[PDB]
Amino acid sequence: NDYRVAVFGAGGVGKSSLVLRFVKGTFRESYIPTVEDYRQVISCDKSICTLQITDSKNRALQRHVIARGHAFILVYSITSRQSLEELKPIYEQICEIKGESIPIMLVGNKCDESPSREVQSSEAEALARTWKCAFMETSAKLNHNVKELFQELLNLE
Numbered sequence: 001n002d003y004r005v006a007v008f009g010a011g012g013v014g015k016s017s018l019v020l021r022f023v024k025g026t027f028r029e030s031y032i033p034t035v036e037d038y039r040q041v042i043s044c045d046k047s048i049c050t051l052q053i054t055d056s057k058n059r060a061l062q063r064h065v066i067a068r069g070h071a072f073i074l075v076y077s078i079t080s081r082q083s084l085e086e087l088k089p090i091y092e093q094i095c096e097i098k099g100e101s102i103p104i105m106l107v108g109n110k111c112d113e114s115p116s117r118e119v120q121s122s123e124a125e126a127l128a129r130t131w132k133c134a135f136m137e138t139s140a141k142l143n144h145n146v147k148e149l150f151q152e153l154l155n156l157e
């Protein structure tokens, strides 16, 4: 019943906003400039066993999080192609450290703002095909397939 995830993405894309809505079902909109931030670690000891999740965005502890981790989420904002570009160094960083059989997921969060949609799902799906990983578009605000994401991550055993 142990279940450990790892969430990656640029600042502000909504890693903790997705994890916080999968663990506690809550969401509360906020804004704060990146100069003030992010990094969160939320792990609630269930009852049967455990459920531990981490969001990462000087010190290169990303190497430690990846080496110790065993299932990764890559989050980019639909309204930011730059944030999608920042995930490729993280993918290569998870490939050099580990092995292929790793369960990886590419998430297009903040899909509720198609008026600001910079990344069309075509460009992203091609990348998911070339990475041999799964891709889906979530929205922590409106709870669009947020549970359907972590469920698909829990299945991969």
Ligand SMILES: Nc1nc2c(ncn2[C@@H]2O[C@H](COP(=O)(O)OP(=O)(O)O)[C@@H](O)[C@H]2O)c(=O)[nH]1
Pocket (backbone or CB within 6 Å): 009, 010, 011, 012, 013, 014, 015, 016, 017, 018, 028, 029, 030, 031, 038, 039, 055, 057, 109, 110, 111, 112, 113, 138, 139, 140, 141, 142
């Ligand atoms: N409109 C909208 N805003 C979102 C969504 N997900 C996250 N946000 C906003 O993004 C802000 C910062 O996200 P955060 O999780 O702190 O960034 P991260 O921890 O670096 O991944 C939050 O205050 C949310 O209001 C979404 O699906 N839709």
